[PDB]
Amino acid sequence: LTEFELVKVPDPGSMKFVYKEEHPFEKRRSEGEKIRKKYPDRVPVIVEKAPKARIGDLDKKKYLVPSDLTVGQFYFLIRKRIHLRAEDALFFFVNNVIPPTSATMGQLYQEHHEEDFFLYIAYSDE
Amino acid sequence: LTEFELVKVPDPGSMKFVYKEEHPFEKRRSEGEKIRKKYPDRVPVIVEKAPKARIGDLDKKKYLVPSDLTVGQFYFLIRKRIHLRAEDALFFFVNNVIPPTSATMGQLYQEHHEEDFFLYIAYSDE
Amino acid sequence: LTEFELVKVPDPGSMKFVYKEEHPFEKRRSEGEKIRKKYPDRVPVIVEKAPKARIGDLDKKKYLVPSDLTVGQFYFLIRKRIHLRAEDALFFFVNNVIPPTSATMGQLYQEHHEEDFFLYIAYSDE
């Protein structure tokens, strides 16, 4: 109708991870499988900023996160790795889905890790 | 005891939706059923501000939200439809319950939509 | 690797509740069991601030929370019991785990209450 607003659907390939552009698949999978052997109780995570976000960027992309660490605990870690105000927000995006903070990184990894053994998380304040 | 605080229970009919006051039930249900036929993969949502909230109001009440859109994605949409600061918060309330942002609007609709085929969401910063 | 960051694991006994230090177990359990008899549809909750948090402290530690109250509703209650700005954040921690706001306090109590019939919640903005 004229008074309804038709909500547009977000483009699922809007977020492009630089780590996937610069490294071919076989190199990434070989790297992720080695890190899984060295740290079987940790999960390799790629964290990049959404290009539209205006909060600070990350010095390092790659993180070895323990499986029992929750998403909420990982949220406070990433905040203390970028330049932002205490009042600024930050949201994690895994396949454009904000994961529950009560879930562990191991549960989030086991459900959404890609074929290169890496879990890709985008962050943005908007 | 004297040192305990007895937490009061929030009145479940504190939130009154204006769309339900101005339109009788048969008119709302006939409107919601038509919009479900025209857009079977979308859900009609009524979004109104809690009267006590001091953040900006909504120009439009009615939204046709795709079923696969998550609550978190719908959260960013409503923020970009009202006047508020980047530091201001916003929370959705469905029957005075804050829905999980990881849930899809279709799942939220199928569980809480009323008899007029509409899903009612209240928002407030407090 | 040199480019990975090894995420440290948070000390689970970092948070010490003052209510447990000042009162022995038998006194706390006897207090919690009495309050469960007087209010079978309410749950006793101990809320204390994490020492590292810079937001305001709580005048009262002990709260009798109805079982059907959600964590999100209890979140707004605690905000209106301390000195903080509208832009300041606040997070609940139960065993260093941020509980889902959609869960009820009764569900959260039944899963995480300790042997003294009390549910211990820590809060902090960081």
Numbering used by the authors:
A (entry chain A), B (entry chain A), C (entry chain A): -13 to 112
What did the authors write?
To provide a molecular basis for the binding of these LIR motifs to Atg8-family proteins, we determined the crystal structure of the WT LIR motifs of PIK3C3, BECN1, and ATG14, as well as the phosphomimetic S249E for PIK3C3, and S96E for BECN1 LIR motifs. The determination of the crystal structures of GABARAP chimeras containing phosphomimetic LIR mutations S249E in PIK3C3 and S96E in BECN1 provided us with valuable information to explain the increased binding observed upon phosphorylation. The PIK3C3S249E LIR bound GABARAP similarly to the WT PIK3C3 LIR in its C-terminal moiety (from residue F250 [PIK3C3] to P256 [PIK3C3]); however, we observe some variation in its N-terminal moiety. As shown in peptide array binding assays, the increased binding and broadened specificity of the S249E mutant of PIK3C3 extended to include LC3B. Thus, in vivo phosphorylation of S249 may enhance the LIR interaction in PIK3C3. Using phosphomimetic mutants of known phosphorylation sites preceding the BECN1 and PIK3C3 LIRs we revealed a marked increased affinity for binding of BECN1 to GABARAP, GABARAPL1 and LC3C with a striking increase in affinity of the phosphomimetic mutations at S244 and S249 for PIK3C3 of up to 19-fold.
Initiation of macroautophagy/autophagy is mediated by the ULK1 (unc-51 like autophagy activating kinase 1) protein kinase complex and the autophagy-specific class III phosphatidylinositol 3-kinase complex I (PtdIns3K-C1). Here, we show that PIK3C3, BECN1 and ATG14 contain functional LIR motifs and interact with the Atg8-family proteins with a preference for GABARAP and GABARAPL1.
